[PDB]
Nucleic acid binder design. Structure first.
Ligand SMILES: [Mg+2]
Ligand SMILES: [Mg+2]
Ligand SMILES: [Mg+2]
Ligand SMILES: [Mg+2]
Ligand SMILES: [Mg+2]
Ligand SMILES: [Mg+2]
Ligand SMILES: [Mg+2]
Ligand SMILES: [Mg+2]
Ligand SMILES: [Mg+2]
Ligand SMILES: [Mg+2]
Ligand SMILES: [Mg+2]
Ligand SMILES: [Mg+2]
Ligand SMILES: [Mg+2]
Ligand SMILES: [Mg+2]
Ligand SMILES: [Mg+2]
Ligand SMILES: [Mg+2]
Ligand SMILES: [Mg+2]
Ligand SMILES: [Mg+2]
Ligand SMILES: [Mg+2]
Ligand SMILES: [Mg+2]
Ligand SMILES: [Mg+2]
Ligand SMILES: [Mg+2]
Ligand SMILES: [Mg+2]
Ligand SMILES: [Mg+2]
Ligand SMILES: [Mg+2]
Lengths: 53, 210, 102, 203, 147
RNA sequence: CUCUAGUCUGGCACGGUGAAGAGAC
RNA sequence: AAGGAGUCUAACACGUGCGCGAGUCGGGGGCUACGAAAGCCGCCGUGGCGCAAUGAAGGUGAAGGCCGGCGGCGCGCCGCC
RNA sequence: CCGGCGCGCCGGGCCCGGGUCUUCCCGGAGUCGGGUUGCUUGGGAAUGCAGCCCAAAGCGGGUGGUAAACUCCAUCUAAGG
RNA sequence: CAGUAACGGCGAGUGAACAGGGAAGAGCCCAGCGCCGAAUCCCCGCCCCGCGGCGGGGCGCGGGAAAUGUGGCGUACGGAA
């Protein structure tokens, strides 16, 4: 009966989702995560809907 | 020993509380079990609604909640008798019945009667024999569009009557609300002793005549 | 005068129309029937009277009503049951007089 | 019906007829053993009300128990501890003498099931009860769907688990503000829930 | 985070922050609220005045629901209805006054603390206080009682 | 200091059938 | 040589960081490999705490001032629009 | 391999309801309850249980969180499953 | 709800219930009172079938249980004719 679980406020969870999403469209922040994206054409890498098929 | 400033706390940890500790590590396991049991029941009663029988319009007692409305246990026998539904047949078509309920008012009684009528208009009844239709049942075109309802049947929603901005009249401007509250409280508090003093005044003064 | 519904006072409460229904059949219980009255007083002439109420009728015959009430109250319990026992135990005393008078 | 007459007849226990019958029957049952089989119910309307049906497999046993309270079974004085628990004489058993009589019948007849029991007489030192017993393996009980619930293994020793009426009266259960301490299964079930600390995952 | 606690910096120090002379003994003054009359009396009187004794009448079967009476002040009276309820009466010329049902918003008694804007109201409430009804009559308004 | 086995004593019940007598109000 | 002693849970206080803000919080419930996680519900906000105190309690419950007219007291005051 | 979900047939059962009037009937006793004793409960002039004594009624009985009397109300139907 | 009403050398400490939101949700049967020719139940022998949770119909001037009360209608939501 140690407190294993923590509860986080929903607005802070959504705020962290927004901060993680907005950092994924920046060059230096994804380079500093180490992802090899030097030849990626655009950083919001959006593809067409036949990829789901 | 107490510190400088704080509360006087009384922790209820003087018994052997560590033996009777209820941990909740099977809470996400019981949620899945309840969900699977719910879906198995919903597949078992295939065109019947998943919530179950229809629950009646019920006022709440005990003045903190007397303005809200609620789903009760069952429709009363007076309500079923006015609606024209037999009490031993109502449970077969998904109408929840309890015989303990009384009907003190008229407005809630007729509201539940209208509730029964509107559910009876929405009921799509299959024949007891699938190969041969009967008299009091739905036609074949409605049985093929008959689906399963999700959520409570005819959900109960608290409605508030909207009122126009009215022009205040002169007699509404003369109503003293606080004075009426104080005098009504005083007249409720002093009703018995005033009647007893009037009885003594009528009893002492009738001795004079005799 | 301008009157309003109030939560306090002598006629407090929200105003509804009180409908009239048949009385609930659980409320019927405790009523004598012409058959169970016949059975109970039939058992009464067969059996007779208890020794304490036999003493209480002797107490009521000499018109000691307060002592008869106190004795019955001490013997059976509550004051309501004592009054109800004393009323029937004096009605049977009056019935024994009108049977032997003529 | 005669049963209504016998019922109102047994309510006049202070009358001459009933004080004669109760005294001679108490004398008769005092000369027998502490537990023996009655050939038929002594009080048939009350056995009938408690659930006796006069058919094959329904057994009546008459039994006597000793009256009084419960002396604490401890050597001479010497119940060792604080002054609260020095009581030995004026203590009382938590279960009724009828409930003791039911389990003394049911332990000696373990192949049968206790249904109910009723009072038939008493004196200064004995109280006399008659216990209704059902054979759960007779075919008249097995094939009757009204009384085939007693044949189930759930109802083994109802009189020992306190599920008959007499042992049921001592558990303090019922609906109301007077029986708050047995909300749940029982008194111990209420205590377990009230003294069980619920420690959630997220507190 | 036990790495941030005081214990990790107390390794090597003999008494572990608890003293060489007065040791960390088990219960050197009693357990819990012991000695409120006798040897913790100065703390109990200097910080908890009134803790010992009986005041007032007992009420055996008290249920909190009978005395349920939530209050709203008149400075919150206009927040119960929408903004287009308030501004339509301001632009209104026929003198019609909007009706505020505080029992619908979940209040029983109206107290009068703040100001009211100079426009007519019809307040329906279960209870009213005296200054609450006079501040409504002074701005020009109705205090309707409901049950 | 506060209790307690045991024991003495009084009441109620098990607990009836008659004869006399002395009684209080 | 190895093991070896301020730990865990609950409650409270104060400080500090974050989010929202007269509101805030889904912790219980429900929907839809890691995942027993994460996401969502708003007529699921019930309910908790805060937004109102005081009295043992019945109960009560958080600025006013000036001017004009009228009535009363003998120029001021009180009551009244 | 086992079981469920169904159809046809045989041998059986069951020979059935609803509504309005009219006439009838209806309840659990050494139990409730009272006193006292002991344990128990948050239950406090006694919450529950038990021993002993007393011991019911039928427009009755129980409950209505302060003992008791009177008078109205409200709400169930204990002592069988 | 709530560490609340309340209990407590009213000290230490102990301590529910109702209302409300959900998970689940299902209701019923006797005795009595009555009416039906005991209209009810169990066991043994034979015939055929089922036969590995001992049952079904057909015979037996076969035996018992039961009127000191079995079965059908019928149970407080009223019920019966
Ligand atoms: Mg210190
Ligand atoms: Mg002690
Ligand atoms: Mg140092
Ligand atoms: Mg040291
Ligand atoms: Mg230190
Ligand atoms: Mg120290
Ligand atoms: Mg020192
Ligand atoms: Mg310490
Ligand atoms: Mg001292
Ligand atoms: Mg080492
Ligand atoms: Mg802080
Ligand atoms: Mg009892
Ligand atoms: Mg004990
Ligand atoms: Mg105790
Ligand atoms: Mg009363
Ligand atoms: Mg009272
Ligand atoms: Mg029952
Ligand atoms: Mg029952
Ligand atoms: Mg709180
Ligand atoms: Mg003290
Ligand atoms: Mg305790
Ligand atoms: Mg509840
Ligand atoms: Mg639900
Ligand atoms: Mg019969
Ligand atoms: Mg019932």
């Amino acid at each position: 009966w140690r407190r294993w679980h923590r509860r986080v406020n929903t607005t802070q969870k959504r705020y962290a989702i927004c901060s993680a999403l907005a950092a994924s469209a920046l060059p230096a922040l994804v380079m500093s995560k180490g992802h090899r994206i030097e030849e990626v054409p655009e950083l919001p890498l959006v593809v067409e809907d036949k990829v789901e098929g | 020993a107490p510190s400088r400033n704080g509360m006087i706390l009384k922790p209820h940890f003087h018994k052997d509380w560590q033996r009777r500790v209820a941990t909740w590590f099977n809470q996400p396991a019981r949620k899945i079990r309840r969900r699977k049991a719910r879906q198995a029941r919903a597949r078992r009663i295939a065109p019947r609604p998943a919530a179950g029988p229809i629950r009646p319009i019920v006022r709440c007692p005990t003045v903190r909640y007397h303005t809200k409305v609620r789903a009760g246990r069952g429709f009363s026998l007076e309500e079923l008798r006015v609606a024209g539904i037999h009490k031993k047949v109502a449970r077969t078509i998904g109408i929840s019945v309890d015989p303990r309920r009384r009907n003190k008012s008229t407005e809630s009684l007729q509201a539940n009667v209208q509730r029964l009528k509107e559910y009876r208009s929405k009921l799509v009844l299959f024949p007891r024999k699938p190969s041969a239709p009967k008299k009091g049942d739905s036609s074949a075109e409605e049985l093929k569009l008959a689906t399963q309802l999700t959520g409570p049947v005819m959900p109960i929603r608290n409605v508030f009557k909207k009122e126009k901005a009215r022009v205040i009249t002169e007699e509404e401007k003369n109503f003293k609300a606080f004075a009426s509250l104080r005098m009504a409280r005083a007249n409720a508090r002093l009703f018995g002793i005033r009647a007893k003093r009037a009885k003594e005044a009528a009893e002492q003064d009738v001795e004079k005549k005799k | 005068a301008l009157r309003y519904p109030m939560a306090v006072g002598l006629n407090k409460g929200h105003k509804v129309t009180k409908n009239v229904s048949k009385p609930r059949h659980s409320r019927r219980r405790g009523r004598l029937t012409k058959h169970t009255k016949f059975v109970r007083d039939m058992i009464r002439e067969v059996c007779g009277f208890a020794p304490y109420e036999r003493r209480a009728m002797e107490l009521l015959k000499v018109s000691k009503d307060k002592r008869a009430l106190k004795f019955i109250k001490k013997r059976v319990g509550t004051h309501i049951r004592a009054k109800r026992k004393r009323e029937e135990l004096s009605s049977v005393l009056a019935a024994m007089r009108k049977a032997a008078a003529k | 019906g005669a049963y209504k007459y016998i019922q109102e007849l047994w309510r006049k226990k202070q009358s001459d007829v009933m004080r004669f019958l109760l005294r001679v029957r108490c004398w008769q049952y005092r000369q027998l053993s502490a537990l023996h089989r009655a050939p038929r119910p002594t009080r048939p309307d009350k056995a009938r009300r408690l659930g006796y049906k006069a058919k094959q497999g329904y057994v009546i046993y008459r039994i006597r128990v000793r009256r009084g309270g419960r002396k604490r079974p401890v050597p001479k004085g010497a119940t060792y501890g604080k002054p609260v628990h020095h009581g030995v004489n004026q203590l009382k058993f938590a279960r009724s003498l009828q409930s003791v009589a039911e389990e003394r019948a049911g332990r000696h007849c373990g192949a049968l099931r206790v249904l109910n029991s009723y009072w038939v007489g008493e004196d200064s030192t004995y109280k006399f009860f008659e216990v209704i017993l059902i054979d759960p393996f007779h075919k008249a009980i097995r094939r009757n769907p009204d009384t085939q619930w007693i044949t189930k293994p759930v109802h083994k020793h109802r009189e020992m688990r306190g599920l008959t009426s007499a042992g049921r009266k001592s558990r303090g259960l019922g609906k109301g503000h007077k029986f708050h301490h047995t909300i749940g299964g029982s008194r111990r079930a209420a205590w377990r829930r009230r003294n069980t600390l619920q420690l959630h995952r997220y507190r | 985070p036990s790495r941030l606690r005081k214990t990790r910096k107390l390794r090597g120090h003999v008494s572990h922050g608890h003293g060489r002379i007065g040791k960390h003994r088990k219960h050197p003054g009693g357990r819990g609220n012991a000695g409120g009359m006798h040897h913790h009396r100065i703390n109990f009187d200097k910080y908890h005045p009134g803790y010992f004794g009986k005041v007032g009448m007992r009420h055996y079967h008290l249920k909190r629901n009978q005395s349920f009476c939530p209050t709203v002040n008149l400075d919150k009276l206009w927040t119960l209805v929408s903004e287009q309820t308030r501004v339509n009466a301001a632009k209104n010329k026929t003198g019609a006054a909007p009706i505020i049902d505080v029992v619908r918003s979940g209040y029983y008694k109206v107290l009068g603390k703040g100001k009211l804007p100079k426009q007519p109201v019809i307040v329906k409430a279960k209870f009213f206080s005296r200054r609450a009804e006079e501040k409504i009559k002074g701005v020009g308004g109705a205090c309707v009682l409901v049950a």
